[PDB]
Amino acid sequence: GGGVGVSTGSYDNQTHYKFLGDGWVEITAYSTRMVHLNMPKSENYCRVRVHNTNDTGTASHMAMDDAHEQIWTPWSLVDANAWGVWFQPSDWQYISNNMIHINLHSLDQELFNVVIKTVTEQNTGAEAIKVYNNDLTAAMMVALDSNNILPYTPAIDNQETLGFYPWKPTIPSPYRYYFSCDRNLSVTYKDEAGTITDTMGLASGLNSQFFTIENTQRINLLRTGDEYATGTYYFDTEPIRLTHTWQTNRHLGQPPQITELPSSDTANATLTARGYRSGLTQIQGRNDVTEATRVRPAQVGFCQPHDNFETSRAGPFKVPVVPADITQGLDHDANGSLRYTYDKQHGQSWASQNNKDRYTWDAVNYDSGRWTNNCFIQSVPFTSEPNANQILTNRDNLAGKTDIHFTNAFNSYGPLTAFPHPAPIYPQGQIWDKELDLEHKPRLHTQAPFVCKNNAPGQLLVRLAPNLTDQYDPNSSNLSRIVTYGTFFWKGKLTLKAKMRPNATWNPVFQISATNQGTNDYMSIERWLPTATGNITNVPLLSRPVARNTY
């Protein structure tokens, strides 16, 4: 039933594995958090703009423009979407090593053991002690948006999701969303003479959308004995592959036939002379077949315009880039490696004195990357040994500029392009994402492995109902109210489908393994262990350890 002095739920953070048959595993991940909620700093919906002129008023600083318009709401959201919420590091190891693909099934959520307290300051003076006592009749307002009427607002974008540590309490993310506003910011370079427009526009009768939680939602009122339960949500998603691909566009198909086996282990094999070699090529006018010029089934990976900034009405923004392997040439931005910034709750370490910690994720698929300094375009009719005018290298100045080269603006994407879908990032990364409502849709989102086809799981919104003092004027601009905060337990259940991997290879596969301390190896075990004072860190685990044959 429930009431004062009776718990409305239980605490389960453990993860379970059922083996359903041959190779198939049902993974059930329970997660529970104690959540700390503060009375909102304003009772009102606010429409606020951040316009930073100090940064953008001076030339060439375009890329740091923050200017936008947002609706601030008194509500806060409980957002469970990150991988670090659901699993402990060893679970991720076990899944990553043993399973060929995995998929989302269902999601459950609960709120229980609501506690609301009021704060009074007794013994006013140098002592200034605070007294804490229960308000048994106070309520917490809870709303779930199942129909996704409100703007969809993943909390992991700002790393505001529930913490990754079962035994540490966590806080909600305050709910907010963008509002339509036009921005004009002119494009300049460093120390350029002129004037930067740097203006924002008036509200648009066309594009204005102001949503209210109270008008769009059914709000449940939870006192202490109350509990709230979301129904079971079911994902419709495609499974993601947990094995990386090594196999480049030059590894596809049948190798050339060697003339004979080499005599010693140090010797190299030889091939039929390229003039006499059989094969298929799209080069005209030459009788040759070379491993580089032979036709392949598809383009694996593609060149992407990198550090591309395009401007629509809202302002400049960087065009996303499909994550691919940074090659031996290490260039990160061409291949669009992800870079995370996160706090102690989600990562970092309590030993760290910095405000945030940063990690650059490199794609684990060694096939589709591009190494730009070694890319080139050659003139037609094709020739062996091109001269300087017959080949375009990455050392060539585009539009007479020293640091701009054709690979900056070059886009090779086309019908023949094939690339792997990027990989989940265990402690910090977005599990699922809502699909855009546009008619023509992207083939993949960049940050999130799973995209909900029809309807995303709802956003769970909470706030404290206001406690009013004895004096309340509805027409007053300032509102006096009782200082109040609350805590509650969030529990959720995430079910996944996965399948065990085969091993057909003679040789041992790569695995995620712990390593002794004292060597600086990334997997050195002490990083997953507590310290003497209880400091702990949770760092990104490599994913997709095991290789796969593409073709």
Ligand X SMILES: CC(=O)N[C@@H]1[C@@H](O)[C@H](O[C@@H]2O[C@H](CO)[C@H](O)[C@H](O[C@]3(C(=O)O)C[C@H](O)[C@@H](NC(C)=O)[C@H]([C@H](O)[C@H](O)CO)O3)[C@H]2O)[C@@H](CO)O[C@H]1O
User: Rule CB under 6 A: is residue 357 a binding residue for ligand X?
Assistant: yes
AA letter at 379:
S
Residues between 320 and 349 that touch a second copy (CB under 8 A): 320-322, 325, 327-328, 331-334, 336-345
Which is nearest to 149 in space by CA: 67, 60, 104, 212? Answer: 212
User: Rule CB under 6 A: is residue 219 a binding residue for ligand X?
Assistant: no
Strand ranges inside 194-298, DSSP E? 199-200, 220-222, 228-229, 233-234, 240-241, 244-245
427 or 457, CB closer to ligand X? 427
CA 59 to chain centre: 31
Cα separation, 511 vs 495, whole angstroms: 25
* Binding residue for ligand X, selected from 359, 371, 376, 382, defined by CB under 6 A: 359
> What is the smallest separation between the CB atom of 339 and ligand X, expressed in angstroms?
7
User: Rule CB under 6 A: is residue 325 a binding residue for ligand X?
Assistant: no
Q: Which two tokens stand for residue 106?
A: 């269902």
* Binding residue for ligand X, selected from 125, 194, 285, 518, defined by CB under 6 A: 285
Cα separation, 41 vs 468, whole angstroms: 15
Residue nearest to ligand X (CB): 360
Q: Which residues pair with 174 in a beta bridge?
A: 76
User: Rule CB under 8 A: is residue 399 a binding residue for a second copy?
Assistant: yes
AA letter at 190:
K
Picked from ligand X, a second copy, none, the partner binding residue 359 (CB below 5 to 8 A depending on kind) is ligand X
Q: Which residues pair with 328 in a beta bridge?
A: none
To 10 degrees, the CA torsion angle through 55, 59, 61, 63?
120
78 or 334, CB closer to a second copy? 334
The site map against ligand X for 229-268 (x = CB under 6 A) is ----------------------------------------
Place of tokens 């945030």: 356
User: Rule CB under 8 A: is residue 232 a binding residue for a second copy?
Assistant: no
Picked from ligand X, a second copy, none, the partner binding residue 497 (CB below 5 to 8 A depending on kind) is none
User: Rule CB under 6 A: is residue 275 a binding residue for ligand X?
Assistant: no
AA letter at 263:
S
Window of 103-111, 229-237, 543-551 that interacts with a second copy by CB under 8 A: 543-551
> What is the smallest separation between the CB atom of 357 and ligand X, expressed in angstroms?
5
Q: Which two tokens stand for residue 517?
A: 């301390």
User: Rule CB under 6 A: is residue 332 a binding residue for ligand X?
Assistant: no
User: Rule CB under 6 A: is residue 535 a binding residue for ligand X?
Assistant: no
Cα separation, 382 vs 3, whole angstroms: 83
User: Rule CB under 6 A: is residue 539 a binding residue for ligand X?
Assistant: yes
Residues between 21 and 50 that touch a second copy (CB under 8 A): 21-24, 32, 34, 36, 38, 41-50
Cα separation, 507 vs 481, whole angstroms: 69
Picked from a second copy, ligand X, none, the partner binding residue 455 (CB below 5 to 8 A depending on kind) is none
User: Rule CB under 6 A: is residue 453 a binding residue for ligand X?
Assistant: no
Q: Which two tokens stand for residue 238?
A: 């495609």
Cα separation, 152 vs 147, whole angstroms: 11
* Binding residue for a second copy, selected from 28, 146, 177, 229, defined by CB under 8 A: 177
Looking only at the bridges linking them, the beta strands covering 24-38 and 15-19 are antiparallel
Residues between 70 and 129 that touch a second copy (CB under 8 A): 70-72, 74, 88-91, 93-94, 97-98, 113, 115, 117-125, 127, 129
Q: Which helix (H) or strand (E) holds 95?
A: helix 89-98
User: Rule CB under 8 A: is residue 248 a binding residue for a second copy?
Assistant: yes
Asked if 163 and 490 count as a contact pair (C-beta separation under 8 A), the reply is: no
Q: Which residues pair with 122 in a beta bridge?
A: 129
User: Rule CB under 8 A: is residue 193 a binding residue for a second copy?
Assistant: no
Q: Does the annotation place 52 within a ligand binding site? A: no
User: Rule CB under 8 A: is residue 210 a binding residue for a second copy?
Assistant: yes
Phi, psi of 85 (to 5 degrees): -70, -45
165 or 376, CB closer to ligand X? 165
Q: Which residues pair with 340 in a beta bridge?
A: 359
Cα separation, 488 vs 349, whole angstroms: 26
Window of 192-200, 251-259, 306-314, 356-364 that interacts with ligand X by CB under 6 A: 356-364
Window of 224-232, 354-362, 435-443, 481-489 that interacts with ligand X by CB under 6 A: 354-362
User: Rule CB under 8 A: is residue 195 a binding residue for a second copy?
Assistant: no
Distances (CA, A) of 66 to 54, 127, 309: 11, 43, 14
User: Rule CB under 6 A: is residue 485 a binding residue for ligand X?
Assistant: no
Q: Give the ranges where 470-530 is alpha helix by DSSP (H).
A: none
Asked if 547 and 244 count as a contact pair (C-beta separation under 8 A), the reply is: yes
The site map against ligand X for 360-389 (x = CB under 6 A) is x-----------------------------
> What is the smallest separation between the CB atom of 106 and a second copy, expressed in angstroms?
20
Specify binding-site residues for Mg(2+): 147
Provide the binding-site residues for ligand X, judged by CB under 6 A. Answer: 285, 357-360, 539
Specify binding-site residues: 147
